[PDB]
Amino acid sequence: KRYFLMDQGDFFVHFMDLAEEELRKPVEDITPPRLEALLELALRMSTANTDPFKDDLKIDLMPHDLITQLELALSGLEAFSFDYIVKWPLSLIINRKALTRYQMLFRHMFYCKHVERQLCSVWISNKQWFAGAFTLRQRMLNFVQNIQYYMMFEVMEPTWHILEKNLKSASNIDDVLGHHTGFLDTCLKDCMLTNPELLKVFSKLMSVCVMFTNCMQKFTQSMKLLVSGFEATINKFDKNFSAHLLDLLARLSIYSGMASVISRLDFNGFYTERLERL
Amino acid sequence: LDVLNKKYSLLDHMQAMRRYLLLGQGDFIRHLMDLLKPELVRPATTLYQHNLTGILETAVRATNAQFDSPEILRRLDVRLLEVSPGDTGWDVFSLDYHVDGPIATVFTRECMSHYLRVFNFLWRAKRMEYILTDIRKGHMCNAKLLRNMPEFSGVLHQCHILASEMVHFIHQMQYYITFEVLECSWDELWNKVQQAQDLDHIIAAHEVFLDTIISRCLLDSDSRALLNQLRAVFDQIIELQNAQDAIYRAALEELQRRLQFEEKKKEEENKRIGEFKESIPKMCSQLRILTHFYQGIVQQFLVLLTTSSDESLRFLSFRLDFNEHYKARE
Amino acid sequence: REIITLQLGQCGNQIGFEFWKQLCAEHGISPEGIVEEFATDRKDVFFYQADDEHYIPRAVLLDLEPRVIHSILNSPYAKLYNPENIYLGNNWASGFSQGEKIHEDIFDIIDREADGSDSLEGFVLCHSIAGGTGSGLGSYLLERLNDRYPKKLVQTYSVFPNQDEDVVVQPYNSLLTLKRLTQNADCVVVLDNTALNRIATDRLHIQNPSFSQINQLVSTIMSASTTTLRYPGYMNNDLIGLIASLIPTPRLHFLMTGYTPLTTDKTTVLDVMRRLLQPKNVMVSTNHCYIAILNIIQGEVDPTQVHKSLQRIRERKLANFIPWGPASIQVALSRKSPYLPSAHRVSGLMMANHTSISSLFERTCRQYDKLRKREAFLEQFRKEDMFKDNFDEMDTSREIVQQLIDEYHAATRPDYISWG
Amino acid sequence: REIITLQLGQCGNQIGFEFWKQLCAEHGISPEGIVEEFATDRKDVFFYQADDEHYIPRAVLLDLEPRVIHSILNSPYAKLYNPENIYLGNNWASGFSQGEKIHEDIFDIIDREADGSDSLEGFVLCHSIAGGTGSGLGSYLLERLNDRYPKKLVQTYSVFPNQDEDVVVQPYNSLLTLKRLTQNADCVVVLDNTALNRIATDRLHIQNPSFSQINQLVSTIMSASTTTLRYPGYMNNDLIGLIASLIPTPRLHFLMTGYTPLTTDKTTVLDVMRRLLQPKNVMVSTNHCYIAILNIIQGEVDPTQVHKSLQRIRERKLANFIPWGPASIQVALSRKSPYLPSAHRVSGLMMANHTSISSLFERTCRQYDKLRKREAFLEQFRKEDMFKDNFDEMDTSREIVQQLIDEYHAATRPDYISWG
């Protein structure tokens, strides 16, 4: 859990700061051993140097990215994943299935941590000069951070405190398996990972988030070196992002916990409700 | 007996079945009602079972019911009824307490169906006491801001007298159903079960306890007529709920607009006095026919409580008509 | 939902610490709030649950010119009552004005308790009428709570003072408090110093230390009045459910008390009911009639005889009433607690709405009217005169309480169907 | 990346000293920096790791006209803080000039620490506004750091002084410092001497020795504000992560503080949030509204109740704010540390943007404007006049801070989408 579900944050922030410059390069333009040595460095540098089975963590790639769910030219942006070498007796509980669920959870939340670090590094770009971009920056952030805090302390941590009890009160190694697969599947479903529509609202929302963070920084490095590329693009982004945000909130609201994140997002009552559906 | 008593605990299931499915705990039913008012008043055709389960869990945590064994605390579950057309949740909602296995031997399908009839009766006779108590809740909590408008105070008192006349019918039928249908029968059951040696005398005595509740209450096919007239009173309570709701609803609606009118100051309100002086007569006559209809039904029911069984029903007529307000030609 | 007890004024706080101490012994609680080792009860409503079994009551203790609250503090039970919610004249106007400057922080104290409770049903005031500091402040607070909690209810264990008539301005004080209580209080349970003193002379030889001993008596009333809530059952599992039958019309919301074994220090239910209906066991001092009666008995009561007992009382006709209300007498049972003495194995209490209390209201109105004509004690202290130059709130109170008197006697009339 | 704390000035060094001692006790560190025998934490960020488990903090202690830094030296914790990085008027200009002569060697001290760290995210200044020596030097150093580290960030735990208004030149000094802070500081956390002094009068009787005890309060603020970083969590595992939410527009980067158990010497999340939003728990002295709120809770917090808690706070609607921003409040959780007392098992804090602090800025601009018309304290000391003959940096600061005030009130307006 510490690595795939990311309980330790020291190791990930140190890993990301040292790695992202390599990550921005596309596939076939980066080397696995570079990242492997970097993982070793970050792992020993962190305060996660106490646990024993850390020394065997295998960075591996995922070719088809989210198409795997039942771009190719991006590695480190969208094709990164941890892997773990399981001993044969334990390969039972953590098998190809369970380790893949660990991966497709971890990679999905990797995008979330990724866009959060993108928006925060994008903000320090500037720490006339129309403040619409700034206004867009908070909304996008607090969406990311509120979704994540929900993920952090509603599904992962509490349900793991439940699994640590169920496997503490199991009697046999078919019941350990029932509890383990029930945990992993239940946490995936209670997270936004599982949906009939896949929550493509979320994919497009994070897509436009990455577009804004990329392009915003592009003109800013131009800027140290005018409003069609600044304010017009911000308001287009603001419109599209608000639209998909409300569409997402509405869908999370039709869903019978669940829509408590909508009530989280509209706390003070700004845009408490715009278009009541039907 | 000795093995069911310990292994699968017939004793504790039959001990807590009163406390939960026959409203023995009472605190639990109160807290369940308190939190479950909104969903039930909402039309339950939209509602679904998972919400009721989730709220029930925290209800059980809120009451002293949690201080019981987890097996019985987990067997209990909410039951949807047939989704009656154009209905509200209050009419279709009942606990089940699904049971399967060893204890199901004592608690058969016939037992569960008769417990559901019993719960059908007690949920009405429990909801309506809390309905009338919400009537008194709104009455005292709307009157305390409406005595600078003495136009309404006079009509208000007429609603008060009817609501507090309705209180006694229930709160007397309650101390009937409590200590004459669900404690004497239970004490009889409990002694005859704790003393038993053969298990067939557990079964054939618990069924007597069941079939004596069904007769000391009005659910039997012969007391069905008395229950049928009781349906009219249990209807008129929620009729007063809708009436009371309207008389406060639009009255207070105007009062709020009067506050906004004086805030505009910070002729329209003369038109509001006009609609007031034409609304007082119609509402007065409506409430008058309501009171008269309630008298016409309660008097016929109270005389219908003649010596028929007389273990508790002639006695109950005395209970209702203490001070001889009724039978003196009202 | 849990009940918060808003004990205020010196006298009110006195009856308050005794009520809480009575429930401390009665429940499995020691003087430090820790669960008693020797210890089936619904302790949710009256005691907030701390993690280490410190059962701290939801007591709001309001002090003004504190003298006795320091004595409350230097007591063994100080650790027990620790929400840390105590925030620092003999005239009602002075008390109202002193409350008006402190309203917000005492209300934040109210808010905190209401918030800590998962839910809140009732605010129970240990009010002292004509209590100098207690009155005025209690009336102001009573006018404030209703506005902020329009849905919620206020009960008042009002100790109406009759000491054979020292404070000279008592009628004025009580007149004003009754106006606020008549319009802004959902229920009131009336107690009487003279009635309890007469009972004190009966059961014991105590005459001079009246206040100290009568505290016990009012504590017994207060605890027994709530025992049906504090212990589970089949009915009157909520305060409002109990209040409804007692309280038939909003104006006539003053409730008479009685206790069957006044000398509680086997008797069948027939004996207990009859004995109680007699006026000696009643604890309060043209035809007149009850409006409605309720009884709760706690002890070794046989079930089959209780309803027959109602039959027998119905043959006896001891309680005479022919009111507009068709409400009968309400026979109820509650659980006598363990760990305390069970002497007089069966013991009961009654709450009833009686028109006789209108007489007690009219006695203080008579004193006020005489004092008003003489105009001897307007007080005229600059506080009094500036706060009320018109002095017309007194006349507003007089007309409101006169409406109450007329309403009581109209309820006695056969035609309280018409306007009262 | 590791954080370096640039504690400067007498007051700033006092609060940094207390803060590092607070994290010594809180972390597994003794007064000599050795790992404690009795001792799960992310000590990388705030403490440099020596080979023999000397956890020396990345503290840069800047002294000017040293008096209290000698006292800091003759302490048990001198061995704890040994990077050996201490390098030797009451006017902002005098402090700025005295810094301008020593800038290079102190910046070499900065360089060495940035180098010895594997990595560097932030410079956290224990700055004192209108601190005589502290101010001016802090503004100059603030101007140097952003140029020399354009990518890196500066936070300022600025103690704005409000002491009911001895130094006569306070408005002038503070005015200049706010100009430098408004344009050259990435984040600022506002604290107020009078606000914390009022809290001191509330929780305790201390009035005269205000500075000594208030140090404890600010130390608690400062340690608790970083606990989410100092201990691993699932979110806010980096300073910029938390800072981004707290600051929605660059100009408005000043952060109000709050702490649930001010008397921290079980309470559910519903209670701690509810209590915290009240103004008594706040530690700072036309419509007005927050821009964005954040809350961190450290204790025995049940998880399923936290989201429901935010729901309940939403119906309570206590901190209602209608800013151009859409940012909602955030319930975040951090780990209460071992080895220290767990009294008040659940204890929380809030960082928020409130437009109210515009008032506090405007008060010192008001004092400055009055003083500026009078010309009563231009100082005109040869230092002051030669450094500023035009005296026009003060007017530049006045127009910059006036832009800030106007921007605050524009944020209150519905149309901060337009230029503020």
DSSP, residue by residue, B101-162: SHHHHHS-HHHHHHHHHHHHHHHHHHHHHHHHHHHHHHHHHHHTT-TT-HHHHHHHHHHHHH
Neighbouring chains to A with at least 3 Cβ pairs closer than 8 Å: B, D
Helices A157-166 & A175-190, crossing angle to 10 degrees? 170
Helices D193-203 & D210-230, crossing angle to 10 degrees? 100
Which chain D residues have a beta carbon less than 8 Å from that of C108?
278, 280
Size of interface B-C (CB pairs under 8 A): 152
The SS3 assignment for C388 reads: coil
Rounded (5°) CA angle B249-B254-B255? 100
Minimal C-alpha gap between C107 and chain D (Å): 12
- Which residues contact residue D38 at a Cβ distance below 8 angstroms, ignoring those fewer than 6 apart? D28, D339
**Is C133 annotated among the ligand-binding residues?**
yes
Alpha-carbon distance of C280 to C278, in angstroms, equals: 6
Give the length of chain B.
330
- Positive/negative CA dihedral, B126, B132, B136, B139: positive
Alpha-carbon distance of D357 to D289, in angstroms, equals: 11
Q: Which two tokens stand for residue C316?
A: 């006896």
Alpha-carbon distance of A70 to B264, in angstroms, equals: 63
Strands D120-125 and D153-156: parallel
Residue type, C109: I
Alpha-carbon distance of C131 to C169, in angstroms, equals: 10
Output the DSSP codes for C391-406. Answer: -HHHHHHHHHHHHHHH
CB proximity C309 to B under 8 Å: no
Q: Are the CB atoms for D374 and D273 separated by under 8 Å?
A: no
Strands D187-189 and D159-160: unpaired
SS (H, E, C) D105-169: HHHHHHHHHHHHCCCEEEEEECCECCCCCHHHHHHHHHHHHHHHCCCCEEEECCEECCCCCCCCC
CB proximity A256 to B under 8 Å: yes
Q: Which of D266, D270, D280 sits opposite C115 (nearest CB)?
A: D270
Which chain D residues have a beta carbon less than 8 Å from that of C112?
271, 274-275
**Nearest CA-CA partner of A193 in A110, A275, A250, A97:** A110
CB proximity C327 to B under 8 Å: yes
Q: Which residues pair with C29 in a beta bridge?
A: C35
Chains D, A in contact, 3 or more Cβ pairs below 8 Å: yes
Q: Which two tokens stand for residue D393?
A: 């940096």
Burial class (CB in 10 A: 0-12, 13-18, 19+), B80: middle
Minimal C-alpha gap between D163 and chain A (Å): 32
Which chain A residues have a beta carbon less than 8 Å from that of D332?
149
- Positive/negative CA dihedral, C77, C83, C84, C88: negative
Q: Which of A13, A127, A131 sits opposite D186 (nearest CB)?
A: A127
Q: Are the CB atoms for C321 and C291 separated by under 8 Å?
A: yes
Q: Which two tokens stand for residue C385?
A: 């005169």
Cβ contact, residue pair A123, D240, below 8 Å: yes
Tell me the C-alpha to C-alpha distance, in Å, between residue C224 and each of B330, C221, C232, C287, C295. 35, 5, 14, 31, 11
Helices (H), chain A: 10-23, 32-45, 88-91, 96-123, 132-150, 157-166, 175-190, 200-224, 233-254, 260-265
Q: Are the CB atoms for D48 and D58 separated by under 8 Å?
A: yes
| D393 phi and psi angles, rounded to 5 deg | -65, -30
Using the 8-state DSSP alphabet, how is residue D29 labeled?
Answer: B
Q: Which of A6, A119, A268 sits opposite D328 (nearest CB)?
A: A268
**Is D130 annotated among the ligand-binding residues?**
yes
- Positive/negative CA dihedral, C110, C114, C115, C117: positive
**Nearest CA-CA partner of D125 in D187, D47, D69:** D187
Closest chain A CA to residue B50: A256
Map tokens 């009428």 to a residue.
C129
Method: cryo-EM
The interface residues of chain A toward chain D in range 87-126, judged by CB-CB distance below 8 A, are: 116-117, 119-121, 123-124, 126
CB proximity C2 to B under 8 Å: no
Q: Which of C153, C292, C326 sits opposite B140 (nearest CB)?
A: C153
Alpha-carbon distance of C98 to C65, in angstroms, equals: 10
Closest chain A CA to residue D304: A154
Alpha-carbon distance of B250 to B283, in angstroms, equals: 12
**Is D241 annotated among the ligand-binding residues?**
no
Alpha-carbon distance of A262 to A246, in angstroms, equals: 9
Alpha-carbon distance of C337 to C328, in angstroms, equals: 28
Chains A, C in contact, 3 or more Cβ pairs below 8 Å: no
Residue type, C325: G
Residue type, C107: F
**Nearest CA-CA partner of D224 in D384, D333, D84, D72:** D333
Residue type, D84: E
Alpha-carbon distance of C34 to C55, in angstroms, equals: 7
Long-range interactions of D67-75: CB distance < 8 A, separation 24+? D67/D10, D68/D10, D68/D13, D68/D14, D69/D10, D69/D13, D72/D13, D72/D17, D75/D17
Closest chain A CA to residue B54: A257
Minimal C-alpha gap between A117 and chain D (Å): 7
Cβ contact, residue pair C307, B174, below 8 Å: no
CB proximity A228 to B under 8 Å: no
CB proximity C120 to B under 8 Å: no
Map tokens 């991966």 to a residue.
A103
Alpha-carbon distance of D45 to C173, in angstroms, equals: 67
Alpha-carbon distance of D263 to D200, in angstroms, equals: 10
The interface residues of chain C toward chain B in range 269-308, judged by CB-CB distance below 8 A, are: 292, 303-304, 306-308
Alpha-carbon distance of C185 to C247, in angstroms, equals: 12
Q: Which of A10, A128, A150 sits opposite D44 (nearest CB)?
A: A10
Alpha-carbon distance of B190 to C134, in angstroms, equals: 52
Q: What is the resolution of this structure in A?
A: 3.7
Using the 8-state DSSP alphabet, how is residue C354 labeled?
Answer: E
Using the 8-state DSSP alphabet, how is residue D35 labeled?
Answer: B
Rounded (5°) CA angle A57-A63-A68? 100
Strands C290-299 and A80-84: unpaired
**Nearest CA-CA partner of A193 in A107, A259, A129, A115:** A107
| Residue of D265, D275, D277, D314 to mutate when probing chain C, most C C-beta within 10 A | D275
Tell me the C-alpha to C-alpha distance, in Å, between residue A87 and each of A40, D133, D280. 20, 63, 57
Q: Could you tell me how far CA B224 lies from the centroid of its own chain?
A: 18
Using the 8-state DSSP alphabet, how is residue C266 labeled?
Answer: -
Cβ contact, residue pair C234, B182, below 8 Å: yes
Q: Which two tokens stand for residue D50?
A: 């020596």
Alpha-carbon distance of C11 to C197, in angstroms, equals: 16
Q: Are the CB atoms for B161 and C410 separated by under 8 Å?
A: no
Which chain A residues have a beta carbon less than 8 Å from that of B48?
256
The SS3 assignment for C161 reads: coil
**Is C132 annotated among the ligand-binding residues?**
yes
| Residue of C289, C307, C400 to mutate when probing chain B, most B C-beta within 10 A | C307
